[PDB]
Symmetry: D2
């Protein structure tokens, strides 16, 4: 299953909060704003995320202007946060951190 | 100059309205939602736009989820719509239309 | 299986030859050069192919300079042309044709 | 001018050799192979380079398969290595090093 147990969810939220993600209050979704130096960096980062979204069949809701990228993750068919969201968030952290 | 004359602005708005763009009421900006078949198409389109944004040093405000891309254009330093916005919009129409 | 039957291979080669691909003589691989108007188009095309490569876990050998993209497809683990190569080639044709 | 003085060329070659580039013997061009962990990384890197190529109007000759990217730089109109090649190489080093 892609569903999180209560234990897995608790742990995922701790880990994601440590990584700077927040939970939305009105949706079962997580959110984070990334700020790069420029658009070259931001769009290079988006390109990596896009590749992974297609590998996983799991897609972000995201906004960009120049160096800023705002990302909301949730599992659109399920209506809830799942292991797919946690995995994509962890990949996004890796893609962002390298620059 | 990148500034539009009154005549050039009037004509640009007519052309952009014909292309499905709208003017925002609260900002001097234009807006359009694009709907593709899938994310592969949407992100391929975004990649072309990103390339052009760097060629022009002129960047969109944009939101994507899966096949949908929402774009707002304005010239951030100027506070107004300029020839840069018109040129980028026309390029975006070309990139979208080819699929 | 991803392997082609003799019938499926014969048919795939006919279809791919009609689409402008050639068979290499020294490898069980197919090859085609694409020529676009510019790099914006060529790299937009590459971005779509890259997305699909990650969706499929199947990667091209490719060369680009400006508007030209040369692609060789074969299944690297198998040493032969497979259904993965045919599927990716058909996707590449779609991505190229739209511009 | 984009042309290198003899002093600037000597210094550029030293710096680029330190960065792992080589001079081709038969062309006035420089060459380097990059090896990433995977295609996600390699294509994210290519996307950054593509953006910069359009910003600069200066394009690589490059080959990719999975995690490997081979790049040859020269100024196609000039027939020689120029400041554009040095600048793009330095950008490529930055894009590669971050991962």
């Amino acid at each position: 299953t892609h569903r999180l147990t209560a234990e897995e969810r608790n742990q995922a939220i701790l880990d994601l909060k440590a990584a700077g993600w927040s939970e939305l209050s009105e949706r079962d979704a997580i959110y984070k704003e990334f700020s790069f130096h420029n658009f070259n960096q931001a769009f290079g980062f988006m390109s990596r995320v896009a590749l992974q979204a297609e590998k996983m069949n799991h897609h972000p809701e995201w906004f960009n202007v120049y160096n800023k990228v705002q990302i909301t993750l949730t599992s659109h068919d399920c209506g809830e946060l799942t292991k797919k969201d946690v995995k994509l968030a962890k990949f996004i952290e890796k893609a962002a951190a390298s620059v």
